[PDB]
Amino acid sequence: NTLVKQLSSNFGAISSVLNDILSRLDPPEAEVQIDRLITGRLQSLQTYVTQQLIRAAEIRASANLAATKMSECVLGQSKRVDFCGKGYHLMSFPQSAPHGVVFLHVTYVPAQEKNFTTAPAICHDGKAHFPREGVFVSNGTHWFVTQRNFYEPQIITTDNTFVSGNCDVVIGIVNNTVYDPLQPELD
Amino acid sequence: DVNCWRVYSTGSNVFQTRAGCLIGAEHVNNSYECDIPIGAGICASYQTSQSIIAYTMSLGAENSVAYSNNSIAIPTNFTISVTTEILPVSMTKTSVDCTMYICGDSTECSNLLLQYGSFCT
Amino acid sequence: AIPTNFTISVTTEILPVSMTKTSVDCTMYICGDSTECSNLLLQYGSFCTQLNRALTGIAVEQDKNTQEVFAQVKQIYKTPPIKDFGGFNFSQILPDPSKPSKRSFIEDLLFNKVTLDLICAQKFNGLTVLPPLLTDEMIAQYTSALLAGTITSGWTFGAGAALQIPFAMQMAYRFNGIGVTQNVLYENQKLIANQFNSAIGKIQDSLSSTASALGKLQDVVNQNAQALNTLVKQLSSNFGAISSVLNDILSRLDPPEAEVQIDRLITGRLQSLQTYVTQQLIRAAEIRASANLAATKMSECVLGQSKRVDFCGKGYHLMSFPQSAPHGVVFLHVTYVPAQEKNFTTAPAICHDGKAHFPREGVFVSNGTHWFVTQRNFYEPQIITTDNTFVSGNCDVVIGIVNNTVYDPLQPELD
Ligand SMILES: *[C@@H]1O[C@H](CO)[C@@H](O[C@@H]2O[C@H](CO)[C@@H](O)[C@H](O)[C@H]2NC(C)=O)[C@H](O)[C@H]1NC(C)=O
Ligand SMILES: *[C@@H]1O[C@H](CO)[C@@H](O[C@@H]2O[C@H](CO)[C@@H](O)[C@H](O)[C@H]2NC(C)=O)[C@H](O)[C@H]1NC(C)=O
Ligand SMILES: *[C@@H]1O[C@H](CO)[C@@H](O[C@@H]2O[C@H](CO)[C@@H](O)[C@H](O)[C@H]2NC(C)=O)[C@H](O)[C@H]1NC(C)=O
Ligand SMILES: *[C@@H]1O[C@H](CO)[C@@H](O[C@@H]2O[C@H](CO)[C@@H](O)[C@H](O)[C@H]2NC(C)=O)[C@H](O)[C@H]1NC(C)=O
Ligand SMILES: *[C@@H]1O[C@H](CO)[C@@H](O[C@@H]2O[C@H](CO)[C@@H](O)[C@H](O)[C@H]2NC(C)=O)[C@H](O)[C@H]1NC(C)=O
Ligand SMILES: *[C@@H]1O[C@H](CO)[C@@H](O[C@@H]2O[C@H](CO)[C@@H](O)[C@H](O)[C@H]2NC(C)=O)[C@H](O)[C@H]1NC(C)=O
Ligand SMILES: *[C@@H]1O[C@H](CO)[C@@H](O[C@@H]2O[C@H](CO)[C@@H](O)[C@H](O)[C@H]2NC(C)=O)[C@H](O)[C@H]1NC(C)=O
Ligand SMILES: *[C@@H]1O[C@H](CO)[C@@H](O[C@@H]2O[C@H](CO)[C@@H](O)[C@H](O)[C@H]2NC(C)=O)[C@H](O)[C@H]1NC(C)=O
Ligand SMILES: *[C@@H]1O[C@H](CO)[C@@H](O)[C@H](O)[C@H]1NC(C)=O
Ligand SMILES: *[C@@H]1O[C@H](CO)[C@@H](O)[C@H](O)[C@H]1NC(C)=O
Ligand SMILES: *[C@@H]1O[C@H](CO)[C@@H](O)[C@H](O)[C@H]1NC(C)=O
Ligand SMILES: *[C@@H]1O[C@H](CO)[C@@H](O)[C@H](O)[C@H]1NC(C)=O
Ligand SMILES: *[C@@H]1O[C@H](CO)[C@@H](O)[C@H](O)[C@H]1NC(C)=O
């Protein structure tokens, strides 16, 4: 709109209508007037073209980002944090909009939480026990092992841990028992 | 860039900030979230009386996690959420014309423009 | 080749986030203070109204870049008075409540190492500088909140609620994600703590001995000043007229003859202003791209652990900490690197009872008389049993299989 409205400026000439100039003057004294209008209009065209060229690069960069998001968040599962919405990512759905794209990210978010007391390792018979997968927890009277992102207590067994070295080298080890499920079946 | 002194239409409720002298906006001492920016950590919004409120931005609530050396927190329940994002992909395609714009339908103007080089190809 | 020892390193990264916000004013710049000059300018339709609408568009983005990079926490976390982090020592980067501008020591060194009337010179010509929306105290608070999040909540606080966990177990989890089992960490607690403390101590000495890396953060500022100076100096050229003084031309010639000199001066000054604004527009894009890259690094390397190689430091990434610097950000990456390698002879598989055994984890090695299986990134021999391998077919198709014996612990127990 600004570019099209620029056509009305006198640019230091008699009138902004070219037919008025070439209906009132003889060409030897009309060319010098027409030159100013030509110069001004050419400058305005240059400015508009430069602005469009500048904006195109930004739009192309945004388009490339959208392409990467489409390739990663949709055609698969991405473990990059905050690249497919807040929280952990599960899936995405694309939608089309006039001159744009809309992404629907589905995310999984942990809701509640509880207090617990934990220890890094367990010493049973002079050997330190470590959790194969998960973490040790204890509600003050018993000890269980549970997965990281959910509450699901289980009994400590030799099929759920692994041994390494001897205790008294770990900073905060605590002592307890281990089930060893094979023993009752042996008898 | 004036300091409160020189005014031309002043009533009351004159306030001084780091971004200039503010006239017409009431000043309070309770923080909120920024709605209409002003600057230098000052934001203004139209909350309740019926006047304009000017205040300092609040970054949010403050909490301190009950940290320890043998205490842990485990979730017991979860939630599914859905979020939306909007991204532009293109804009309007346009095209102009050399002679139709600069010279219109005139014939002498085109010959005069030929004096210039290739400034429109 | 197998490593047998490891080293913790700390690396730094510097990124510019934003630049100073300026604004012009044509009527007091091109025309100074005159009536005829403004009347002549009125013939050019809507140039300066467009220029002032573009410069404010540039300026408004500088207050959004910092918000996109730093404001990524919905709360404000506070470090506890308890300072038993298993041996680690964050005293150099935690906020110090001893000065009114509460900042950490390294932030103070960063501020002192960057050195910024010019404003009155602009006021001669209507040029002005606008202050940023977020004051430096707010940025310091944001950085303190982000740093306190990772100390006492691991990386859970960035994806929901904040859950506390002792620092030792968090570091053990972080090693678990780079291919080293947990039992290494608890057997080297003091050794890791001392190395981390010494690495942190080295950084301040490096920055206190005239570091040449901060120049990248400095350079941009210099450039702006340079360009701005050029603009003012442009006013001291006659552009082919009699003189560059506006009032002198009106004071020594008739108006119908002075109008042409006025027009020449107007054209020259307008062209100079256009060139300056185009330069500003060009530079804004580079700064914005750098800001977006910094935001991506902040979201990935800090609020979590990234398995991308050479994106959060050189080596296997462990964590990172942010620091605020004048118009920029500084990242401290903590990294794990193997140290001393030893030779071994390997073999793909083992077949014992006519069936090939493949290792369920790690790799088969042998010192020359006996065979062990060990995890890939650290030397730790174990006896080959049926809890470490799995069977697949008969040994006739593997290229380099070799005889050996598998323990099978159940049989001694049942005996
Ligand atoms: C901690 O949780 C355990 C697991 O349920 C509780 O132990 C059980 O308690 C019930 C009754 O409270 C008994 O009937 C079970 O026999 C117990 N199981 C075992 C393996 O002993 C324990 O009571 C909880 N402690 C606290 C303080 O809440
Ligand atoms: C956990 O319990 C074991 C016993 O099963 C403790 O081992 C003994 O502890 C006593 C006193 O703490 C020592 O005098 C003995 O020398 C230890 N060894 C034995 C009896 O073989 C172990 O110390 C306990 N760990 C704790 C309390 O952290
Ligand atoms: C803004 O205006 C106030 C109002 O005068 C200034 O306060 C004066 O400061 C000067 C020098 O500091 C003193 O000599 C006057 O006595 C002060 N007068 C009053 C009424 O306070 C204030 O200094 C100005 N702002 C700045 C940055 O100079
Ligand atoms: C886990 O959270 C869900 C949703 O917050 C709980 O499901 C709700 O349970 C209540 C029972 O008190 C019902 O009245 C609601 O209708 C349930 N919600 C829905 C969407 O069906 C669920 O009970 C929670 N689980 C536990 C163990 O607390
Ligand atoms: C792994 O490297 C560390 C140092 O990088 C070794 O610890 C050093 O051990 C020597 C003993 O010869 C001491 O004099 C040094 O003071 C120790 N360094 C530190 C920082 O305490 C460690 O021994 C190496 N591990 C192995 C198995 O060689
Ligand atoms: C953690 O690091 C700080 C920083 O070096 C230690 O504080 C230093 O303590 C020594 C004596 O122990 C003093 O000579 C230094 O002047 C202190 N420096 C500072 C900056 O305060 C601190 O001792 C370390 N350990 C703990 C537990 O904080
Ligand atoms: C390769 O490693 C094995 C396992 O440790 C070494 O065998 C041990 O050697 C020592 C010293 O000769 C004996 O005390 C042990 O009884 C041996 N154990 C077994 C299971 O054989 C062997 O010596 C090592 N070979 C070389 C060349 O270093
Ligand atoms: C595993 O050991 C056997 C030896 O028992 C190696 O080859 C066999 O050798 C015996 C006599 O020495 C022959 O009767 C068998 O026919 C051989 N087996 C085959 C498949 O030809 C066998 O090469 C060893 N595997 C290795 C070295 O990878
Ligand atoms: C866990 O215990 C601490 C101990 O003071 C307490 O501050 C915190 O609120 C507790 N957490 C919950 C979820 O109640
Ligand atoms: C944890 O801190 C308490 C102090 O409240 C201390 O008595 C205990 O020994 C500490 N435990 C570890 C493993 O550092
Ligand atoms: C705001 O400033 C006034 C002026 O001193 C003061 O009386 C008032 O207590 C302040 N507001 C609050 C909430 O303290
Ligand atoms: C492994 O053996 C090769 C050849 O004997 C030798 O060049 C190399 O230095 C050895 N590795 C180490 C760590 O010494
Ligand atoms: C390994 O190379 C040696 C000679 O370099 C050769 O004798 C042997 O058969 C090769 N083994 C395998 C499994 O390629």
mmCIF file with all atom_site columns, N, CA and C in Angstrom, chain A residues 7 35 39 41 48 62 69 100-109 111-114 116-118 150-151, chain B residues 70-88 90 94 101-102 106 116:
data_model
loop_
_atom_site.group_PDB
_atom_site.id
_atom_site.type_symbol
_atom_site.label_atom_id
_atom_site.label_alt_id
_atom_site.label_comp_id
_atom_site.label_asym_id
_atom_site.label_entity_id
_atom_site.label_seq_id
_atom_site.pdbx_PDB_ins_code
_atom_site.Cartn_x
_atom_site.Cartn_y
_atom_site.Cartn_z
_atom_site.occupancy
_atom_site.B_iso_or_equiv
_atom_site.pdbx_formal_charge
_atom_site.auth_seq_id
_atom_site.auth_comp_id
_atom_site.auth_asym_id
_atom_site.auth_atom_id
_atom_site.pdbx_PDB_model_num
ATOM 1   N N  . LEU A 1 7   ? 3.025  7.019   -5.534  1.00 0.00 ? 7   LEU A N  1
ATOM 2   C CA . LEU A 1 7   ? 2.910  7.563   -6.884  1.00 0.00 ? 7   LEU A CA 1
ATOM 3   C C  . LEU A 1 7   ? 2.388  8.992   -6.929  1.00 0.00 ? 7   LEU A C  1
ATOM 4   N N  . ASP A 1 35  ? 12.600 14.130  -15.653 1.00 0.00 ? 35  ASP A N  1
ATOM 5   C CA . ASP A 1 35  ? 13.735 13.423  -15.069 1.00 0.00 ? 35  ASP A CA 1
ATOM 6   C C  . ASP A 1 35  ? 13.587 13.268  -13.558 1.00 0.00 ? 35  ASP A C  1
ATOM 7   N N  . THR A 1 39  ? 13.508 9.757   -11.449 1.00 0.00 ? 39  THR A N  1
ATOM 8   C CA . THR A 1 39  ? 14.468 9.461   -10.390 1.00 0.00 ? 39  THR A CA 1
ATOM 9   C C  . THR A 1 39  ? 13.766 9.054   -9.101  1.00 0.00 ? 39  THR A C  1
ATOM 10  N N  . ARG A 1 41  ? 10.658 7.904   -8.562  1.00 0.00 ? 41  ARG A N  1
ATOM 11  C CA . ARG A 1 41  ? 9.946  6.636   -8.652  1.00 0.00 ? 41  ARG A CA 1
ATOM 12  C C  . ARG A 1 41  ? 10.916 5.463   -8.678  1.00 0.00 ? 41  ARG A C  1
ATOM 13  N N  . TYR A 1 48  ? 11.473 -0.666  -2.149  1.00 0.00 ? 48  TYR A N  1
ATOM 14  C CA . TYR A 1 48  ? 10.512 -1.750  -1.970  1.00 0.00 ? 48  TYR A CA 1
ATOM 15  C C  . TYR A 1 48  ? 11.139 -3.104  -2.281  1.00 0.00 ? 48  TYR A C  1
ATOM 16  N N  . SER A 1 62  ? 12.384 -19.672 8.514   1.00 0.00 ? 62  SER A N  1
ATOM 17  C CA . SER A 1 62  ? 11.266 -20.253 9.249   1.00 0.00 ? 62  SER A CA 1
ATOM 18  C C  . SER A 1 62  ? 10.740 -21.502 8.553   1.00 0.00 ? 62  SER A C  1
ATOM 19  N N  . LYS A 1 69  ? 11.034 -29.671 11.886  1.00 0.00 ? 69  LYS A N  1
ATOM 20  C CA . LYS A 1 69  ? 10.051 -30.096 12.876  1.00 0.00 ? 69  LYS A CA 1
ATOM 21  C C  . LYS A 1 69  ? 9.136  -31.172 12.312  1.00 0.00 ? 69  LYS A C  1
ATOM 22  N N  . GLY A 1 100 ? 0.575  -21.375 6.155   1.00 0.00 ? 100 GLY A N  1
ATOM 23  C CA . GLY A 1 100 ? 1.220  -21.828 7.370   1.00 0.00 ? 100 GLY A CA 1
ATOM 24  C C  . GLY A 1 100 ? 0.827  -23.238 7.749   1.00 0.00 ? 100 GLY A C  1
ATOM 25  N N  . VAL A 1 101 ? 1.526  -23.741 8.764   1.00 0.00 ? 101 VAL A N  1
ATOM 26  C CA . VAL A 1 101 ? 1.303  -25.087 9.267   1.00 0.00 ? 101 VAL A CA 1
ATOM 27  C C  . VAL A 1 101 ? 1.067  -25.018 10.769  1.00 0.00 ? 101 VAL A C  1
ATOM 28  N N  . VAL A 1 102 ? 0.260  -25.953 11.263  1.00 0.00 ? 102 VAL A N  1
ATOM 29  C CA . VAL A 1 102 ? -0.091 -26.050 12.673  1.00 0.00 ? 102 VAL A CA 1
ATOM 30  C C  . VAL A 1 102 ? 0.297  -27.436 13.160  1.00 0.00 ? 102 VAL A C  1
ATOM 31  N N  . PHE A 1 103 ? 0.999  -27.495 14.278  1.00 0.00 ? 103 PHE A N  1
ATOM 32  C CA . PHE A 1 103 ? 1.401  -28.758 14.868  1.00 0.00 ? 103 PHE A CA 1
ATOM 33  C C  . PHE A 1 103 ? 0.638  -28.992 16.161  1.00 0.00 ? 103 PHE A C  1
ATOM 34  N N  . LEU A 1 104 ? 0.147  -30.218 16.329  1.00 0.00 ? 104 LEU A N  1
ATOM 35  C CA . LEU A 1 104 ? -0.462 -30.671 17.575  1.00 0.00 ? 104 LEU A CA 1
ATOM 36  C C  . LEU A 1 104 ? 0.489  -31.689 18.192  1.00 0.00 ? 104 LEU A C  1
ATOM 37  N N  . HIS A 1 105 ? 1.154  -31.306 19.275  1.00 0.00 ? 105 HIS A N  1
ATOM 38  C CA . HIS A 1 105 ? 2.047  -32.206 19.988  1.00 0.00 ? 105 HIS A CA 1
ATOM 39  C C  . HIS A 1 105 ? 1.301  -32.838 21.153  1.00 0.00 ? 105 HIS A C  1
ATOM 40  N N  . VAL A 1 106 ? 1.410  -34.159 21.283  1.00 0.00 ? 106 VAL A N  1
ATOM 41  C CA . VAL A 1 106 ? 0.883  -34.884 22.432  1.00 0.00 ? 106 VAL A CA 1
ATOM 42  C C  . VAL A 1 106 ? 2.039  -35.170 23.374  1.00 0.00 ? 106 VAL A C  1
ATOM 43  N N  . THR A 1 107 ? 1.882  -34.811 24.642  1.00 0.00 ? 107 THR A N  1
ATOM 44  C CA . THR A 1 107 ? 2.957  -34.924 25.612  1.00 0.00 ? 107 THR A CA 1
ATOM 45  C C  . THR A 1 107 ? 2.468  -35.639 26.862  1.00 0.00 ? 107 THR A C  1
ATOM 46  N N  . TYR A 1 108 ? 3.398  -36.326 27.519  1.00 0.00 ? 108 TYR A N  1
ATOM 47  C CA . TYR A 1 108 ? 3.137  -37.072 28.741  1.00 0.00 ? 108 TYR A CA 1
ATOM 48  C C  . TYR A 1 108 ? 3.810  -36.349 29.897  1.00 0.00 ? 108 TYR A C  1
ATOM 49  N N  . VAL A 1 109 ? 3.049  -36.063 30.957  1.00 0.00 ? 109 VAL A N  1
ATOM 50  C CA . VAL A 1 109 ? 3.512  -35.220 32.047  1.00 0.00 ? 109 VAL A CA 1
ATOM 51  C C  . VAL A 1 109 ? 3.252  -35.907 33.382  1.00 0.00 ? 109 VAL A C  1
ATOM 52  N N  . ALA A 1 111 ? 2.236  -36.355 37.139  1.00 0.00 ? 111 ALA A N  1
ATOM 53  C CA . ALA A 1 111 ? 1.254  -35.532 37.833  1.00 0.00 ? 111 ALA A CA 1
ATOM 54  C C  . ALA A 1 111 ? 1.588  -35.277 39.296  1.00 0.00 ? 111 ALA A C  1
ATOM 55  N N  . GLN A 1 112 ? 1.513  -36.306 40.132  1.00 0.00 ? 112 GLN A N  1
ATOM 56  C CA . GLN A 1 112 ? 1.694  -36.148 41.567  1.00 0.00 ? 112 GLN A CA 1
ATOM 57  C C  . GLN A 1 112 ? 3.093  -36.587 41.972  1.00 0.00 ? 112 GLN A C  1
ATOM 58  N N  . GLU A 1 113 ? 3.366  -36.511 43.272  1.00 0.00 ? 113 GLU A N  1
ATOM 59  C CA . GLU A 1 113 ? 4.649  -36.964 43.790  1.00 0.00 ? 113 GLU A CA 1
ATOM 60  C C  . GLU A 1 113 ? 4.515  -37.245 45.277  1.00 0.00 ? 113 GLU A C  1
ATOM 61  N N  . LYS A 1 114 ? 5.435  -38.061 45.786  1.00 0.00 ? 114 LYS A N  1
ATOM 62  C CA . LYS A 1 114 ? 5.446  -38.398 47.202  1.00 0.00 ? 114 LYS A CA 1
ATOM 63  C C  . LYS A 1 114 ? 6.869  -38.377 47.735  1.00 0.00 ? 114 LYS A C  1
ATOM 64  N N  . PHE A 1 116 ? 10.027 -39.832 49.864  1.00 0.00 ? 116 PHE A N  1
ATOM 65  C CA . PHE A 1 116 ? 10.590 -41.130 50.206  1.00 0.00 ? 116 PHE A CA 1
ATOM 66  C C  . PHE A 1 116 ? 12.035 -40.942 50.642  1.00 0.00 ? 116 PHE A C  1
ATOM 67  N N  . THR A 1 117 ? 12.563 -41.940 51.346  1.00 0.00 ? 117 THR A N  1
ATOM 68  C CA . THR A 1 117 ? 13.960 -41.955 51.758  1.00 0.00 ? 117 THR A CA 1
ATOM 69  C C  . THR A 1 117 ? 14.700 -43.043 50.996  1.00 0.00 ? 117 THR A C  1
ATOM 70  N N  . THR A 1 118 ? 15.882 -42.703 50.487  1.00 0.00 ? 118 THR A N  1
ATOM 71  C CA . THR A 1 118 ? 16.603 -43.554 49.553  1.00 0.00 ? 118 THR A CA 1
ATOM 72  C C  . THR A 1 118 ? 18.062 -43.689 49.958  1.00 0.00 ? 118 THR A C  1
ATOM 73  N N  . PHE A 1 150 ? 7.821  -43.799 37.691  1.00 0.00 ? 150 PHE A N  1
ATOM 74  C CA . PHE A 1 150 ? 6.540  -44.278 38.183  1.00 0.00 ? 150 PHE A CA 1
ATOM 75  C C  . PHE A 1 150 ? 6.759  -45.000 39.501  1.00 0.00 ? 150 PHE A C  1
ATOM 76  N N  . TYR A 1 151 ? 5.693  -45.126 40.277  1.00 0.00 ? 151 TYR A N  1
ATOM 77  C CA . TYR A 1 151 ? 5.750  -45.803 41.563  1.00 0.00 ? 151 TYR A CA 1
ATOM 78  C C  . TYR A 1 151 ? 5.218  -47.218 41.394  1.00 0.00 ? 151 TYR A C  1
ATOM 79  N N  . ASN B 2 70  ? 19.294 -37.593 51.620  1.00 0.00 ? 70  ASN B N  1
ATOM 80  C CA . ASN B 2 70  ? 18.730 -38.936 51.580  1.00 0.00 ? 70  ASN B CA 1
ATOM 81  C C  . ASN B 2 70  ? 17.225 -38.895 51.348  1.00 0.00 ? 70  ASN B C  1
ATOM 82  N N  . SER B 2 71  ? 16.744 -37.889 50.622  1.00 0.00 ? 71  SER B N  1
ATOM 83  C CA . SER B 2 71  ? 15.325 -37.727 50.343  1.00 0.00 ? 71  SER B CA 1
ATOM 84  C C  . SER B 2 71  ? 15.114 -37.674 48.839  1.00 0.00 ? 71  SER B C  1
ATOM 85  N N  . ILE B 2 72  ? 14.074 -38.358 48.363  1.00 0.00 ? 72  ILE B N  1
ATOM 86  C CA . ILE B 2 72  ? 13.746 -38.410 46.945  1.00 0.00 ? 72  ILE B CA 1
ATOM 87  C C  . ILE B 2 72  ? 12.241 -38.248 46.785  1.00 0.00 ? 72  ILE B C  1
ATOM 88  N N  . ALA B 2 73  ? 11.834 -37.856 45.584  1.00 0.00 ? 73  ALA B N  1
ATOM 89  C CA . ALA B 2 73  ? 10.431 -37.690 45.241  1.00 0.00 ? 73  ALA B CA 1
ATOM 90  C C  . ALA B 2 73  ? 10.126 -38.515 44.002  1.00 0.00 ? 73  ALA B C  1
ATOM 91  N N  . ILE B 2 74  ? 9.067  -39.312 44.068  1.00 0.00 ? 74  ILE B N  1
ATOM 92  C CA . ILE B 2 74  ? 8.667  -40.201 42.986  1.00 0.00 ? 74  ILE B CA 1
ATOM 93  C C  . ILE B 2 74  ? 7.233  -39.863 42.610  1.00 0.00 ? 74  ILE B C  1
ATOM 94  N N  . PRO B 2 75  ? 6.901  -39.782 41.324  1.00 0.00 ? 75  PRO B N  1
ATOM 95  C CA . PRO B 2 75  ? 5.502  -39.597 40.934  1.00 0.00 ? 75  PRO B CA 1
ATOM 96  C C  . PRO B 2 75  ? 4.686  -40.852 41.179  1.00 0.00 ? 75  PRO B C  1
ATOM 97  N N  . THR B 2 76  ? 3.370  -40.670 41.261  1.00 0.00 ? 76  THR B N  1
ATOM 98  C CA . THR B 2 76  ? 2.447  -41.786 41.375  1.00 0.00 ? 76  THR B CA 1
ATOM 99  C C  . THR B 2 76  ? 1.317  -41.746 40.364  1.00 0.00 ? 76  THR B C  1
ATOM 100 N N  . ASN B 2 77  ? 1.267  -40.734 39.505  1.00 0.00 ? 77  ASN B N  1
ATOM 101 C CA . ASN B 2 77  ? 0.184  -40.590 38.545  1.00 0.00 ? 77  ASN B CA 1
ATOM 102 C C  . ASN B 2 77  ? 0.656  -39.668 37.435  1.00 0.00 ? 77  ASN B C  1
ATOM 103 N N  . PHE B 2 78  ? -0.033 -39.728 36.301  1.00 0.00 ? 78  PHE B N  1
ATOM 104 C CA . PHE B 2 78  ? 0.412  -39.023 35.112  1.00 0.00 ? 78  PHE B CA 1
ATOM 105 C C  . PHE B 2 78  ? -0.756 -38.331 34.425  1.00 0.00 ? 78  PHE B C  1
ATOM 106 N N  . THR B 2 79  ? -0.428 -37.592 33.367  1.00 0.00 ? 79  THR B N  1
ATOM 107 C CA . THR B 2 79  ? -1.400 -36.823 32.610  1.00 0.00 ? 79  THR B CA 1
ATOM 108 C C  . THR B 2 79  ? -0.960 -36.758 31.155  1.00 0.00 ? 79  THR B C  1
ATOM 109 N N  . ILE B 2 80  ? -1.937 -36.636 30.262  1.00 0.00 ? 80  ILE B N  1
ATOM 110 C CA . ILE B 2 80  ? -1.703 -36.432 28.840  1.00 0.00 ? 80  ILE B CA 1
ATOM 111 C C  . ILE B 2 80  ? -2.140 -35.020 28.486  1.00 0.00 ? 80  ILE B C  1
ATOM 112 N N  . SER B 2 81  ? -1.293 -34.300 27.760  1.00 0.00 ? 81  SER B N  1
ATOM 113 C CA . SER B 2 81  ? -1.599 -32.934 27.371  1.00 0.00 ? 81  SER B CA 1
ATOM 114 C C  . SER B 2 81  ? -1.387 -32.770 25.875  1.00 0.00 ? 81  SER B C  1
ATOM 115 N N  . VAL B 2 82  ? -2.061 -31.772 25.311  1.00 0.00 ? 82  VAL B N  1
ATOM 116 C CA . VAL B 2 82  ? -1.985 -31.469 23.890  1.00 0.00 ? 82  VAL B CA 1
ATOM 117 C C  . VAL B 2 82  ? -1.664 -29.991 23.732  1.00 0.00 ? 82  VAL B C  1
ATOM 118 N N  . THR B 2 83  ? -0.635 -29.685 22.948  1.00 0.00 ? 83  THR B N  1
ATOM 119 C CA . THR B 2 83  ? -0.222 -28.309 22.717  1.00 0.00 ? 83  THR B CA 1
ATOM 120 C C  . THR B 2 83  ? -0.191 -28.027 21.222  1.00 0.00 ? 83  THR B C  1
ATOM 121 N N  . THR B 2 84  ? -0.292 -26.747 20.873  1.00 0.00 ? 84  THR B N  1
ATOM 122 C CA . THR B 2 84  ? -0.344 -26.318 19.484  1.00 0.00 ? 84  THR B CA 1
ATOM 123 C C  . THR B 2 84  ? 0.807  -25.369 19.183  1.00 0.00 ? 84  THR B C  1
ATOM 124 N N  . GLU B 2 85  ? 1.300  -25.437 17.949  1.00 0.00 ? 85  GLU B N  1
ATOM 125 C CA . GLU B 2 85  ? 2.307  -24.502 17.465  1.00 0.00 ? 85  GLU B CA 1
ATOM 126 C C  . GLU B 2 85  ? 1.942  -24.051 16.060  1.00 0.00 ? 85  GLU B C  1
ATOM 127 N N  . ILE B 2 86  ? 2.249  -22.792 15.752  1.00 0.00 ? 86  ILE B N  1
ATOM 128 C CA . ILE B 2 86  ? 1.926  -22.183 14.466  1.00 0.00 ? 86  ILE B CA 1
ATOM 129 C C  . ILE B 2 86  ? 3.221  -21.725 13.816  1.00 0.00 ? 86  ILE B C  1
ATOM 130 N N  . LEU B 2 87  ? 3.428  -22.100 12.550  1.00 0.00 ? 87  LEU B N  1
ATOM 131 C CA . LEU B 2 87  ? 4.633  -21.674 11.849  1.00 0.00 ? 87  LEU B CA 1
ATOM 132 C C  . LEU B 2 87  ? 4.309  -21.186 10.440  1.00 0.00 ? 87  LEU B C  1
ATOM 133 N N  . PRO B 2 88  ? 4.802  -20.012 10.054  1.00 0.00 ? 88  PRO B N  1
ATOM 134 C CA . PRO B 2 88  ? 4.609  -19.544 8.680   1.00 0.00 ? 88  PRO B CA 1
ATOM 135 C C  . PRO B 2 88  ? 5.446  -20.343 7.697   1.00 0.00 ? 88  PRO B C  1
ATOM 136 N N  . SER B 2 90  ? 5.079  -19.292 3.866   1.00 0.00 ? 90  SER B N  1
ATOM 137 C CA . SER B 2 90  ? 5.272  -18.460 2.689   1.00 0.00 ? 90  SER B CA 1
ATOM 138 C C  . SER B 2 90  ? 4.450  -17.190 2.831   1.00 0.00 ? 90  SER B C  1
ATOM 139 N N  . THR B 2 94  ? 4.227  -11.500 -5.635  1.00 0.00 ? 94  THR B N  1
ATOM 140 C CA . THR B 2 94  ? 3.881  -10.285 -6.358  1.00 0.00 ? 94  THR B CA 1
ATOM 141 C C  . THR B 2 94  ? 4.816  -10.104 -7.542  1.00 0.00 ? 94  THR B C  1
ATOM 142 N N  . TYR B 2 101 ? 4.715  1.041   -14.551 1.00 0.00 ? 101 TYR B N  1
ATOM 143 C CA . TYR B 2 101 ? 4.773  1.786   -13.301 1.00 0.00 ? 101 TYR B CA 1
ATOM 144 C C  . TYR B 2 101 ? 5.495  3.118   -13.469 1.00 0.00 ? 101 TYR B C  1
ATOM 145 N N  . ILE B 2 102 ? 6.746  3.082   -13.930 1.00 0.00 ? 102 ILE B N  1
ATOM 146 C CA . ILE B 2 102 ? 7.551  4.300   -13.952 1.00 0.00 ? 102 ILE B CA 1
ATOM 147 C C  . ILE B 2 102 ? 7.014  5.289   -14.980 1.00 0.00 ? 102 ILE B C  1
ATOM 148 N N  . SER B 2 106 ? 3.063  6.563   -21.586 1.00 0.00 ? 106 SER B N  1
ATOM 149 C CA . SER B 2 106 ? 3.759  7.540   -22.409 1.00 0.00 ? 106 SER B CA 1
ATOM 150 C C  . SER B 2 106 ? 4.801  6.863   -23.289 1.00 0.00 ? 106 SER B C  1
ATOM 151 N N  . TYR B 2 116 ? 19.095 5.649   -18.985 1.00 0.00 ? 116 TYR B N  1
ATOM 152 C CA . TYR B 2 116 ? 19.597 4.840   -17.890 1.00 0.00 ? 116 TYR B CA 1
ATOM 153 C C  . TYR B 2 116 ? 19.929 3.440   -18.387 1.00 0.00 ? 116 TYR B C  1
#
